[PDB]
Paper text:
The 1-Allo crystal was crystallized with dGTP-α-S in the crystallization mixture and diffracted to 3.4 Å resolution. The No-Allo and 1-Allo mSAMHD1 structures also crystallized as tetramers in different space groups (C2 and P21212) with 4 or 2 copies of mSAMHD1 in the asymmetric unit, respectively. However, this symmetry is broken in the 1-Allo tetramer, which is a dimer of dimers, with only one overall twofold axis. Our No-Allo and 1-Allo structures show that these inactive tetramer intermediates are composed of two relatively rigid dimers with loose tetramer interfaces. Although mSAMHD1 is capable of forming tetramers without nucleotides bound to Allo-site 2, these states are inactive and likely represent activation intermediates of the enzyme. Nucleotide binding to Allo-site 1 causes the dimer components to swing around a pivot point and close in toward each other. Starting from the most open No-Allo state, dimer A′ swings progressively toward dimer A via the 1-Allo-state to close the tetramer interface in the 2-Allo state. Since our experiment did not include GTP or dGTP, which are the only allosteric activators to bind Allo-site 115–17, we conclude that some populations of mSAMHD1 protein were purified with GTP or dGTP bound to the allosteric site 1, consistent with the previous observations. These tetramers likely represent activation intermediates similar to our 1-Allo structure, and they are not fully active states of the enzyme.
The active tetramer form of SAMHD1 is induced by cellular nucleotides, which bind two allosteric sites of each subunit. The SAM domain is not required for dNTP hydrolysis and viral restriction by hSAMHD1, but is essential for these activities of mSAMHD1.
Residue numbers in the entry: 72 to 307, 316 to 379, 385 to 527, 533 to 548, 559 to 563, 589 to 624
Amino acid sequence: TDLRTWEPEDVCSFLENRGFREKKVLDIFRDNKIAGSFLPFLDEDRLEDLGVSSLEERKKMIECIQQLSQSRIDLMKVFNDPIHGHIEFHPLLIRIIDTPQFQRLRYIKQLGGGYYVFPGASHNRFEHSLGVGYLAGCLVRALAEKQPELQISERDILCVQIAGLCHDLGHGPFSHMFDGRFIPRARPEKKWKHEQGSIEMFEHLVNSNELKLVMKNYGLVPEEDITFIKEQIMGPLWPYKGRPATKSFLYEIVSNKRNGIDVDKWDYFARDCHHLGIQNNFDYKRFIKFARICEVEYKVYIRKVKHICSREKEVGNLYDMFHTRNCLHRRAYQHKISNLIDIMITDAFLKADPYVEITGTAGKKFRISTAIDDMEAFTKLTDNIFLEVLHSTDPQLSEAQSILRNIECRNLYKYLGETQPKREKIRKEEYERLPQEVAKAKPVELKAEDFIVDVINVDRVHFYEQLIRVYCKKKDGKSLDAAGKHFVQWCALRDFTKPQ
Ligand SMILES: Nc1nc2c(ncn2[C@H]2C[C@H](O)[C@@H](COP(=O)(O)OP(=O)(O)OP(=O)(O)O)O2)c(=O)[nH]1
Ligand SMILES: [Mg+2]
């Protein structure tokens, strides 16, 4: 048979009939519910920690496990990715992957409104998350072997991979629109980051599916390692609790907001380049091979830390990466129409928010805007909500539908143009005023609602602006002229660049 089929007692019988007949050791296996599937992932040290103090018995135990048909490599699962080719995942990762909480990422478009501008961009967070997991695994492995002095363990590697998988667990419908346009607009009081949702949903994931025990049986320590995983996704003497300062570099792998060089970016750069039809000058495989940990000292008392570093002559590689970063940002991410569509979807959601019910834990009803407060509600919240509204028979959503029908018939707000501030910038508070200002600025009645102003912010490593787009909702010719010249005058008044 397979070990996969084996209950814990089956493993106990196997162990007995293979010579280990001492009830204490069998009790170990019954107690931790070590079903067969775990066996090929057991260590001498794991057997030590579980509590067999027979320095030779552990060896013979593992020998028995080695003799078996099915090995470690025989219980990996191989995904076929067009970005990364084939991809092996350790079974725990699969257990995490195969949950409602995670599978939900199949139904959230990576580029959100993007798909409605770039028909190639049909890809969702699911496959990108897989990719990030895999890449995380690659870099941590490479550093582990090249420098075994680092004491990087299997455990660490799995935690890094899991952090990888789950960095985007907490995105809402249409990805960045939800956490960047809708929630801030619907819950201005609340500060919310998709990462917050990510760690909350991971906590939910492991608990709804009782993977806490499973993690233990694969050699993780849930209490420590879950905090490690969470910390990697979220962020912050030594602030982190998940790992000692001696293992600091691990935190630079999955999310590195400092210098913007991490495996999340690598995957979605490559992937988005793949689907948009853009050629990506950056070979990450070259990066990982020439990646080494080495110590850095900055004097503030001098501080000494272990950062991830790359050979100095692989600086051209980074020039290639940052071009691609800019290339994507310029052409695709801050695309004037994509963002228009995100704005319209948000606008619809806002008008649908009051009436759409989404049940969470104990069946408490939540609104689209508040589902983020209950993971068991948020688990149900996906892009599909777009179509649910659009197709609803509830007549309270007529307002919301009509906006979505306009998206369908390509009847979008008309784009008056872009502008730049010559100096200074616009206070995050000052935003709500802007549609008023444009409306009120005279060169026809034009309400402040008839305008949207879209403010956009354009935005180290170690070796060994503001854009304003104005859209007008009213789509008739005369109002369009009036609005255009309103915008021009508003630009002139604030001493802004001559519109596009
Ligand atoms: N488990 C899983 N596999 C997926 C998913 N998406 C694509 N795949 C691919 C990867 C697998 O290599 C392929 C087959 O996996 P399955 O567990 O469904 O069946 P398989 O034929 O590998 O039998 P096995 O479980 O290895 O005995 O499906 C997913 O969300 N979950
Ligand atoms: Mg990502």
